[PDB]
Design a protein around this ligand. Structure first.
Ligand SMILES: CCCCCCCCCCCCCCCCC[C@@H](O)O[C@H](CO[C@H](O)CCCCCCCCCCCCCCC)COP(=O)(O)OCC[N+](C)(C)C
Ligand SMILES: CCCCCCCC/C=C\CCCCCCCC(=O)OC[C@H](COP(=O)(O)OCCN)OC(=O)CCCCCCC/C=C\CCCCCCCC
Ligand SMILES: CCCCCCCC/C=C\CCCCCCCC(=O)OC[C@H](COP(=O)(O)OCCN)OC(=O)CCCCCCC/C=C\CCCCCCCC
Ligand SMILES: CCCCCCCC/C=C\CCCCCCCC(=O)O[C@H](COC(=O)CCCCCCC/C=C/CCCCCCCC)COP(=O)(O)OCCN
Ligand code: SF4
Ligand code: SF4
Ligand code: SF4
Lengths: 176, 96, 156, 210, 70, 99, 303
């Protein structure tokens, strides 16, 4: 099934010709456009009052990264390097070794936020929910070097945002 | 008609604690709307809602004038909101 | 004394004037330009902050690099930056402009726009939301407010 | 976007027009060879940024064809629904920007509000507004939020009035017609032999739609 | 809403109020409370010069009535 | 005298404003680092000049309407406008208004 | 107290054109389902002051090879003409009462094109020179029909004095006697100031902007005086001032409305518009308005 968009033929009787001439000489459609713009002027704008008002988000939103830990206070990351293997941008660097108590923990965990494409593959490849992409998005920076996160920065991000991150995970983990 | 809207403007002036509060809110947030206070923050931020506004304008925060170490009567930013009020304010959840 | 008071107040006035009217010219290289046009959309309304839409290069205060800067394009961006009058600021938007991003290991991509021009604000994201770019613009405004030129001139 | 255009004119008329491209050549096809299929999926979001979901669907269909598998019916229905949403998004951007270049510039804002609403839909379904990476080569990444379909219906029941406002501002305007009528006329044979597709075919009367 | 455009417009109006009004008041102040005399066609100028000569204070706007007929 | 003073004040205000605009940002130290000849433009300029001359001829019309020779004045004014229309028609028909 | 009158005519005009930018921004924003500037100042009022201060503190890009003389001269001529064109306007009493006020207005408007010519020439760019040539051609083409329409309308007034336009329109507006000439005059004034849909084209830039906006406000005031005749009672001129200012504001807001409503023409399209639709009708209506007072025995008094 197909439709014709511009296959009309104007009527050539005197009344229609006079109507077209009146449109030409009196600019009727121009006043129609003016009137529509005028009507648009008299309605409420759609502008929100940032930063005092914020745009709507969802639990699935992917923002700044964070490293979580168990309720006992022990970090969830076990240096399985799955997030590093799946990272499309090669933005994750991990080095590990046995801890003093023999635990399998990382000694280096860097994320280059100028390489990251914020796809969320790392947080869906993680089997222990250690690395997540939090809901923070207002972390602009004045220098390049501060966008090169290391393990301390990501752990601090997790400790900073744990409440909201855990609430979002609780809200959205049944869809995963 | 006109009388009702001017009366509502007068109530908006009254509801911010007088002329001083009206001017303070107008020069601090460029908005003079009044809504039910939803929450108070341990850093001083106040969180209000108004469900009769359209989506995106139904929730807002008046920032505190003094955060950890800096005066914040003028220099405010969105990174000041604590994570729980950050969740409520961004409409990720319906519960303060 | 009054001598430093005068220059302090003049600094406050000049900084307020400069940051209260920022006229940006945007390099809409790639998909981050779409988020720029959404920050210019009715919901966020950059114009309401005094930040006009699509200023001319000869009358622009801030340059927004929103996209991937390729080797074929770097000279043009540097020329446009050099044509800009002073004081001039550069905002780097998105991973592609910040550090190359998804195309960092490429033969035809400049690994960050800061190899070509100095950058004042880095806006992270792929792409940053319109709210994120607005936050970056307001942070640049705060950075401009912090600066002090007549005072430096006076104590030198 | 970004473009260099070297053209020779004889007064007002355009005599020759040679476009130079490669200013946004990132070398995506060589980078894809170093990634797995899942790792190579997000590049297609960045290929045609105006309509991100459509690009991924094409790649997913190719990979599914090569894998000899098929997605479940619900995944296919979700993919078609979001493809039509992305077509709406693409068309709004294309028509408004074109009008903006001519100089109309009001429908740009009028319709970018709706574009923001569709970006909200994208974010709710995936967490990303533009580079969603929602459509995978086995289906989709995740099931929809419990309240998404009702909001999509609420949005789509008011869009016809927005299109009507756009048409009222543009369709019958004599300036718009004089700017657009009889410009870039292409014959059906030339359109077919030059490799055209989409509206560029259907505008010449060729009845074709994949 | 739309009435937020009214303030600036008001200011603009006030500015456009100043010139013409000012002229009027000045024309009242420099002409003894009357409109500035319009002198085209060189006959009105002759009348103004005659008034200036017969005023006794070299001001055309000082009108002399029947009280000066003696 | 009044008009000359007004023009002098206008020029002085513009000159002072331009001088301060050019010299306020000059006191602070900074980095401080063809042939085509389209004919249709000349033709439209010449057509404008000729129509301007005929407008100059048409200008005394408001005073021309009080002459007691109303028939002759009306005939001459209509003749001048008819000649203007004829010039426009000749330029139109001979492809003088094209691009 | 003549200098005080000159200053009270000049400074308020500059303030009005400074805040017309704010008015235009807010009007366009609200016609675009958004707002204008509302952050700087209580209602965005302090935006023009910030704009001016930022512009006057920004490094000026002298071409470093062009003619500095003309680079400085062009804004001087533009702004001087823009301020000069305001003096004959009766609101209701003109600052300078000219016998031929209309002709002086026309002469200043004709002078206004040397600024465009010199700026394009001193740009030291072939592309900018081409643009300046197109702008000058459009300007002269439309002032032709401006002058013809102006004389056709003034044939009903009896002289070139603008003060007599108030007496002519004591009972009825001039819009009713000739609305087609009024529509053509409005479009020609749009094309005169390079406003949409005819907008095909630091310090000195700001001064050029001030000249253009002053020209816009002046043209709208001239239209209001010429075609919308307010009533002037000699014992309270503030009523006429109020009415005239309101009409001028309405016309300027109509300019903003038209800019926000339509796309722009091509160069050849507006050239053809003028030379093939306005000029023939303008000539025909000039003949009609020459004939009409003689046919109906309604010749205006003054001679
Ligand atoms: C008459 C002669 C003219 C000659 C030239 C003079 C220039 C014109 C004079 C008028 C200047 C207008 C100044 C008004 C600025 C006040 C703005 C105020 O609100 O700023 C606040 C206060 O900040 C600063 O303290 C204000 C500094 C302004 C200048 C300080 C005093 C300078 C007076 C010196 C004048 C003498 C001039 C002599 C040489 C010309 C901070 O707001 P801001 O951060 O933006 O925005 C935050 C947005 N929020 C609130 C919504 C979240
Ligand atoms: C409707 C109203 C709108 C108002 C219209 C515009 C009015 C203009 C008002 C002028 C405000 C004052 C402007 C002062 C700022 C001048 C620029 C500036 O920032 O000066 C900094 C500059 C820094 O130089 P360096 O550090 O050595 O550079 C090294 C790097 N290579 O310092 C100077 O040179 C300034 C010179 C002394 C200025 C102090 C004297 C007071 C001046 C008052 C204004 C004078 C003009 C009027
Ligand atoms: C700039 C414009 C200069 C001339 C503007 C004034 C023209 C005018 O018509 O007014 C002249 C004025 C009023 O005339 P009427 O309306 O007939 O009323 C008199 C009966 N009571 O009377 C005068 O003649 C006085 C002015 C004459 C002396 C000065 C003339 C102006 C000289 C300008 C020299 C500058 C030119 C520089 C080059 C120009 C390049 C742009
Ligand atoms: C019985 C004796 C009567 C005496 C004679 C009276 C006859 C009156 C009847 C006819 C007169 C009507 C003429 C009025 C002007 C006509 C000009 C015209 O029609 O030109 C149009 C074009 O005009 C325009 O398009 C101009 C539009 C400019 C864009 C801005 C829109 C403006 C509308 C907003 C409102 C205008 C307000 C006007 C009045 C303001 C007063 C202050 C034709 O061009 P095209 O359609 O492209 O076709 C030509 C090729 N064949
Ligand atoms: S979000 Fe994607 S690109 Fe960023 S670190 Fe995780 S896997 Fe790598
Ligand atoms: S996938 Fe999780 S547990 Fe494995 S290395 Fe990454 S953060 Fe650690
Ligand atoms: S920064 Fe991210 S969103 Fe922007 S163009 Fe590059 S890949 Fe696309």
């Amino acid at each position: 099934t197909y439709k014709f968009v511009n296959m009309r033929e104007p009527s050539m009787d005197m009344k229609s010709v006079t109507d077209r001439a009146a449109q030409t000489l009196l600019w009727t459609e121009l006043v129609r456009g003016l009137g529509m713009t005028l009507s648009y002027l008299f309605r409420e704008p759609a502008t929100i009052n940032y930063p005092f008002e914020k745009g709507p988000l969802s639990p699935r939103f992917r923002g700044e990264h964070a490293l979580r830990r168990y309720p006992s206070g022990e970090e969830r990351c076990i240096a399985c390097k799955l997030c590093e293997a799946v990272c499309p941008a090669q933005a994750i660097t991990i080095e590990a070794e046995p801890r003093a108590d023999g635990s399998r923990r990382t000694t280096r965990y860097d994320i280059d936020m100028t390489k990251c494409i914020y796809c969320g593959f790392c947080q869906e490849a993680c089997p222990v929910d250690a690395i997540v992409e939090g809901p923070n998005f207002e972390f602009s920076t004045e220098t390049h070097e501060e966008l090169l996160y290391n393990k301390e920065k990501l752990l601090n991000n997790g400790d900073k945002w744990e409440a909201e991150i855990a609430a979002n995970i609780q809200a959205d983990y049944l869809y995963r | 008609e006109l009388v009702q809207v001017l009366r509502r403007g007068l109530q908006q002036v009254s509801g911010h604690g007088g002329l001083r509060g009206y001017l303070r809110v107008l020069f601090r947030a460029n908005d003079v709307r009044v809504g039910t206070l939803v929450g108070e923050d341990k850093y001083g931020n106040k969180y209000y809602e108004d469900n009769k506004q359209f989506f995106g304008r139904h929730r807002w925060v008046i920032y505190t004038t003094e955060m950890n170490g800096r005066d914040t009567f003028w220099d405010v930013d969105g990174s000041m909101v604590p994570p729980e009020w950050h969740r409520w304010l961004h409409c990720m959840t319906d519960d303060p | 004394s009054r001598g430093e008071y005068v220059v302090a107040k003049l600094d406050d006035l000049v900084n307020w004037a400069r940051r209260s009217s920022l006229w940006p010219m945007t390099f809409g290289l790639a998909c981050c330009a779409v988020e720029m046009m959404h920050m210019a959309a009715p919901r966020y309304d950059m114009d309401r902050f005094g930040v006009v839409f699509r200023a001319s290069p000869r009358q622009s205060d801030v340059m927004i690099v929103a996209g991937t800067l390729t080797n074929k394009m770097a000279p043009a961006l540097r020329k446009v930056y050099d044509q800009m009058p002073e004081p001039r600021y550069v905002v780097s938007m998105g991973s592609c402009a910040n550090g190359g991003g998804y195309y960092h290991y490429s033969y035809s991509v400049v690994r960050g726009c800061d190899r070509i021009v100095p950058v004042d604000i880095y806006v992270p994201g792929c792409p940053p939301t319109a709210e994120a770019l607005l936050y970056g613009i307001l942070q640049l405004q705060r950075k401009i407010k912090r600066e002090k030129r007549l005072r430096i001139w006076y104590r030198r | 976007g970004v473009l260099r255009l070297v053209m020779e004119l004889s007064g007002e008329m355009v005599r020759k027009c040679d476009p130079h491209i490669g200013l946004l050549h990132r070398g995506t096809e060589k980078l894809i060879e170093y990634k797995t299929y899942l790792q190579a999926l997000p590049y297609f979001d960045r290929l045609d940024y105006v309509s991100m979901m459509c690009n991924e669907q094409a790649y997913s269909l190719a990979v599914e064809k090569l894998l000899n598998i098929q997605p479940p019916p619900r995944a296919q229905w979700i993919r078609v629904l979001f493809g039509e949403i992305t077509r709406l998004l693409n068309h709004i951007m294309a028509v408004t920007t074109h009008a903006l270049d001519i100089g109309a510039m009001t429908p740009f804002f009028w319709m970018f509000e709706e574009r923001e609403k569709m970006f909200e839909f994208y974010e709710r379904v995936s967490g990303a507004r533009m580079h969603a990476a929602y459509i995978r080569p086995g289906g989709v990444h995740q099931d929809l939020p419990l309240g998404l379909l009702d909001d999509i219906y609420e949005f789509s029941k008011n869009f016809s009035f927005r299109i009507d406002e756009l048409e009222e501002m543009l369709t019958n305007n004599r300036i718009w017609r004089n700017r657009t009528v009889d410009i870039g006329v292409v014959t059906a044979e030339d359109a077919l032999n030059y490799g055209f597709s989409g509206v560029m075919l259907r505008g010449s009367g060729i009845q074709w739609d994949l | 809403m739309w009435f937020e455009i009214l303030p600036g417009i008001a200011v603009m109006a006030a500015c456009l109020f100043i010139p013409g009004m000012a002229t009027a008041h000045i024309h009242k102040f420099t002409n003894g409370g009357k409109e500035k005399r319009v002198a085209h066609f060189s006959y009105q100028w002759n009348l103004m010069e005659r008034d200036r000569r017969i005023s006794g204070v070299n001001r055309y706007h000082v009108t002399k009535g029947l009280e000066n007929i003696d | 005298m009044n008009i000359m003073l007004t023009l002098l004040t206008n020029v002085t205000l513009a000159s002072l404003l331009v001088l301060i605009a050019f010299w306020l940002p000059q006191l602070n130290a900074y980095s401080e680092k063809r042939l085509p000849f389209s004919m249709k433009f000349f033709l439209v300029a010449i057509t404008f000049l000729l129509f301007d001359l005929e407008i100059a001829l048409l200008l005394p019309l408001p005073w021309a309407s009080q002459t007691n020779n109303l028939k002759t004045m009306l005939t001459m004014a209509l003749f001048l406008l008819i000649l203007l229309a004829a010039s426009l028609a000749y330029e139109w028909t001979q492809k003088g208004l094209e691009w | 107290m003549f200098m005080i009158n000159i200053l009270s005519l000049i400074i308020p005009i500059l303030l009005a054109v400074a805040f017309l930018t704010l008015v235009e921004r807010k009007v366009l924003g609200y016609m675009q389902l958004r707002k204008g500037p509302n952050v700087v100042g209580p209602y965005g009022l302090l935006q023009p002051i910030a704009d001016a201060l930022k512009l006057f503190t920004k490094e000026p890009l002298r071409p470093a090879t062009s003619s500095i003389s003309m680079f400085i001269i062009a804004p001087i001529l533009a702004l001087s003409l823009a301020l000069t064109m305001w003096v004959p306007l009766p609101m209701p009493y003109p600052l300078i009462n000219m016998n031929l006020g209309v002709l002086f207005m026309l002469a200043m408007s004709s002078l206004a094109v040397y600024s465009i010519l010199w700026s394009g020439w001193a740009s030291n760019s072939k592309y900018a020179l081409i643009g300046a040539l197109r702008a000058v051609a459009q300007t002269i083409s439309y002032e032709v029909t401006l002058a013809i329409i102006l004389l056709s309308v003034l044939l009903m007034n009896g002289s070139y004095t603008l003060s007599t336009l108030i007496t002519t329109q004591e009972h009825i507006w001039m819009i009713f006697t000739s609305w087609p000439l009024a529509m053509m005059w409005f479009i020609s004034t749009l094309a005169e100031t390079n406003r949409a849909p005819f907008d095909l084209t630091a310090g000195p830039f700001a001064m050029f902007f001030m000249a253009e906006y002053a020209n816009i406000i002046m043209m709208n005031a001239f239209t209001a005086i010429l075609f919308l005749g307010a009533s002037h009672d000699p014992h309270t001129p503030e009523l006429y001032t109020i009415n005239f200012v309101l009409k001028t504001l309405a016309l300027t807001i109509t300019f903003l409305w038209i800019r926000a409503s339509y796309p722009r023409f091509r160069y050849d399209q507006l050239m053809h518009l003028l030379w093939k639709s306005f000029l023939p009708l303008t000539l025909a209506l000039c003949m009609w308005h020459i004939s009409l007072p003689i046919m109906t025995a309604s010749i205006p008094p003054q001679s």
